[PDB]
Assembly symmetry: D2
Homo-oligomer: 265 residues x 4
């Protein structure tokens, strides 16, 4: 039933989801599949924890929010650390089964896109790649139309008297957040008196930690791709490494990094 | 299912994989998802580890040293992920766990077929373990195959025997179902290897790779135990996990450390 | 010394720091540099760890919870580096070590004053250890200061006592030179904290931080032992390191795991 | 003497090299100093191991070269991993003692420059920053005028019949290596028959590992700087993060990554 080790974990279903396509079977295809499936499981947990962080923020539950963010950091760290396994996959080995993948690519990862949206990097154009899946497409639209984790943090600050612009109370959440210079003084005050604003200070650093770890994931991702396919165009239709290098330019919480330039000045 | 074209989710069978997380708590407990995912990610890594370890055995059977080392290198990395991920579960507190532990069954990873496969492959054979898998005839059979076949260590010893090393004749044929017992007659064999790395660089490298594999495995065992300790606190239970730290897969490789010393270097050192 | 302007090397005193690596082997052995650097990098991290742990104590003495947690967070990261770096030394083989171990003295990190300071701060007090530092009156004195002062754990208990927790009166004044002994009367205190995290979130967070610190420290101890095992093989020696794994700094925090269970949650759970 | 724990390790000298300058003493200055000193010790070991790798390559000692490179990878990993400690240093804390540093900066790290030169990223213009130190400047010139680790690998391949250009037998080593398209076929052959060229294949992957880990160090370095000083100009006179982001564009073994694009095609 569900009380046995295997039944509780639904291993019959979990361990029958590895189906290589190369023929004859290529030894390194199992790594390729498992590498992605373990990542998808972590992404599922990450989304589970991040959704809870949003709820805690909405309810002004600071320590609870920090607790779930701490676990979120550990999950992102595992996702980043595991690239080391995939780096044992050489070009010689990969070219032995890359053709079986067809046009598929990471662009079609619904969970990854969900997390990107939740963190704030929204792009309604991505909903298109999931047209074949209206159900999943609907789930992406939901987070797309709701305030991001960052925006909820701003709304939290607003509830406590911080000089947060009125637009953050209600606006087109489907639009990706744009750097807001008027928020600079808000964060300067926090960092200039950490003893008083220790709650806000703690959350600011947690978000910086989360974004930094995410960028590290993006960087290791890019470097792994570079050592596997080099500068070949991707199966998804992009330039490959070039496109992944541009992703490193994206920022989730720009004001948190920009405030550094004026702190203590 | 994107216009007949293969998709990311289709290739990875995500509909099946992502529908395998079914918490039993009701109202659902926030921390049960971690409990499940922690186990499932580990089971996937263990499946890959078995896949790679079997390949390492095949390479040894073919005298393919660099290939064996490469597969073992990947194996070490997989074991490292299995070890590092305990940091996620360490964020589970007693306050959180007491909220859903009641709905769980009384079993642990001791019932993991894939894990047992790894233990068997590395050499920690235990015929009695086959009974706990009686419920599953199929899985029980595949486990019996590895049980009756030489372990990774024994294949390494057989490889050494094929190249002049003073490996005892008993390693050519015996009841492989019985766990390897420390053999002091292997000491001179490993001493010679470590005392002449210029000539035995292949054997030397494989010896260190096996020590790396066992060390990382022991680290996984320790982190496992320390995590269980901070969650439920402290044979059976934590005591059983403590005893597991005393088990060794390649005893002779560690024992030789105490007797190496012959200096066969040329002039100038 | 760049035109009177401070330089990178001058600020960091690199001329002094980078002239502290003096191998004794002659002809010099390639692997002796690793042996030295492995120890020196650890000694530097240990110096920082003491610096941070002392600050954590001060914060507890000032009821400064978020500050204490921040310092402990850095402390965990330093301990993590000390633990992770064993991977470098694991690349030292018996074949390499036997080439220079003869020129070394008979001492180990057991003679590390900075390490002993950490053990003392965390609470593993041992007045007898002061004698091994008899050669150094100064260092022996600074070590005596921490020995005679409440440990990080005892300051945490004193902090709890200042806020209504049922902490025994003996923790207000006693011979701090004596290592803390498991106190079962502390069980109800930690049970209440873990059973009402909404009210005792500060205490709850500090409890988990201390468990993190001890767990990471035990991991350092385990990696230390496993590395020594693969280098020299297996009280004293490896047996001593094995016994060190049985020591606990905050026993009551781990013991409470076995008795927590009161559900004080509101409706709906 | 030198037989005691402290005497052997010269701790009296090592543990008296931490001298903060802030007045009053700033708590976080010790971290700043130790963070760099531990890194410098690892860099010293890294140089020690890399020099040995070069010697092994010159003597065609493959497994020995791989052994030292393996340790080199572990050292680079520690150097990269330790950034996590420094990330606990917030802008608020740093601004409390950054002023005491004056014009000093990582540009003045002789050991780091030495390693950069040894790996092949040579720039005679850096010798200038070390004018105040002629002795150390002389040590940098030595590695500057000698073949890099990569060039020695090419010379190794040349000794075994690989189609290596004649210029690699003798040339102006002080000049940084420039991408050589004529090397593409050399590496393609290696990756196309790994069973035969397993020795060359192994070394190629070791170099890819080393460069990838080095780039990871550069990335974490840049991200840490971003969360500490943001986009402020550096004490060394550069744009700061902008300059460190450009460093990520540098490559040690370009042909090893470029070959990926044509492997199996
Ligand atoms: C053999 C190793 C891998 C290679 C060569 C590779 C390659 C690529 C390439 C070329 C792209 C760009 C789109 C395209 O043109 O295809 C991409 C995107 C992406 N990949 Fe990777 N990949 C690998 C492994 C992984 C793994 C293990 C994951 C984790 C599940 C992953 C997740 C993603 C994601 C989420 C995107 C979308 C990013 C975005 O839209 O910013 N990849 N990959
Ligand atoms: C906080 C959660 C966990 C607790 C309390 C726990 C507890 C235990 C206990 C008490 C045992 C000893 C045998 C027994 O009495 O059943 C055990 C064994 C085992 N557990 Fe863990 N466990 C946890 C999580 C995990 C995870 C995530 C894995 C990864 C799949 C795992 C894998 C294993 C394995 C493979 C054994 C067998 C070891 C052996 O036979 O030496 N456990 N567990
Ligand atoms: C391969 C090299 C090493 C070997 C063979 C080794 C061996 C030992 C042994 C046998 C002991 C037990 C006490 C004794 O008999 O002296 C010990 C204790 C100790 N060692 Fe290691 N060690 C090595 C490297 C290191 C390093 C790099 C450090 C970092 C500073 C270190 C730190 C310590 C400490 C702090 C103790 C005291 C522990 C305690 O009192 O619980 N050792 N070592
Ligand atoms: C508080 C943390 C740190 C900050 C804000 C920082 C900042 C900077 C900046 C702004 C530069 C560019 C040159 C300039 O304009 O100054 C630089 C360069 C450099 N830094 Fe860092 N740094 C930090 C920590 C470290 C550490 C721990 C190391 C390790 C020893 C390090 C090593 C280097 C090196 C080697 C360069 C020269 C790189 C090159 O020429 O490519 N820094 N740093
Ligand atoms: N975009 C990759 C192909 C790819 C990478 N990861 C995955 C995962 C998956 F399920 C399918 C394809 C892929 C390439 O250009 O080679
Ligand atoms: N370039 C840094 C200053 C800096 C960073 N690391 C060091 C090390 C050192 F010995 C002196 C200064 C520095 C800044 O712009 O803030
Ligand atoms: Mn003998
Ligand atoms: Mn000897
Ligand atoms: Mn009670
Ligand atoms: Mn209960």
């Amino acid at each position: 039933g569900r009380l046995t080790y295997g039944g509780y974990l639904r291993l019959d279903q979990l361990l029958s989801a590895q189906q290589p396509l190369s023929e004859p079977a290529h030894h390194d295809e199992m790594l390729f599949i498992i590498q992605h499936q373990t990542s998808e499981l972590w992404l599922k947990l990450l989304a589970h924890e991040l959704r809870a962080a949003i709820v805690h923020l909405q309810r002004d539950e600071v320590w609870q929010c920090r607790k779930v963010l701490a676990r979120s950091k550990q999950v992102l760290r595992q996702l980043t650390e595991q690239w080391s396994v995939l780096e044992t996959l050489t070009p010689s080995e990969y070219m032995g089964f890359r053709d079986v993948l067809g046009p598929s690519s990471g662009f079609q990862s619904l969970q990854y896109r969900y997390i990107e949206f939740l963190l704030g990097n929204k792009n309604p154009q991505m909903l298109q790649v999931f047209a074949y899946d209206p159900a999943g497409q609907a789930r992406l639209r939901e987070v797309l139309e709701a305030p991001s984790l960052y925006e909820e943090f701003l709304r939290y600050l607003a509830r406590f008297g911080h000089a947060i612009p009125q637009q953050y109370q209600a606006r087109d959440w489907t639009a990706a957040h744009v750097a807001d210079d008027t928020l600079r003084p808000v964060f300067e005050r926090i960092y200039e008196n950490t003893d008083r604003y220790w709650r806000e200070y703690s959350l600011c650093e947690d978000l910086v930690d989360v974004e930094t770890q995410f960028q590290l994931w993006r960087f290791r991702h890019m470097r792994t791709v570079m050592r596997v396919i080099g500068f070949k165009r991707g199966t998804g239709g992009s330039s490959g490494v070039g496109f992944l290098q541009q992703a490193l330019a994206l920022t989730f919480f720009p004001e948190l990094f920009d405030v550094r330039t004026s702190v203590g000045v």
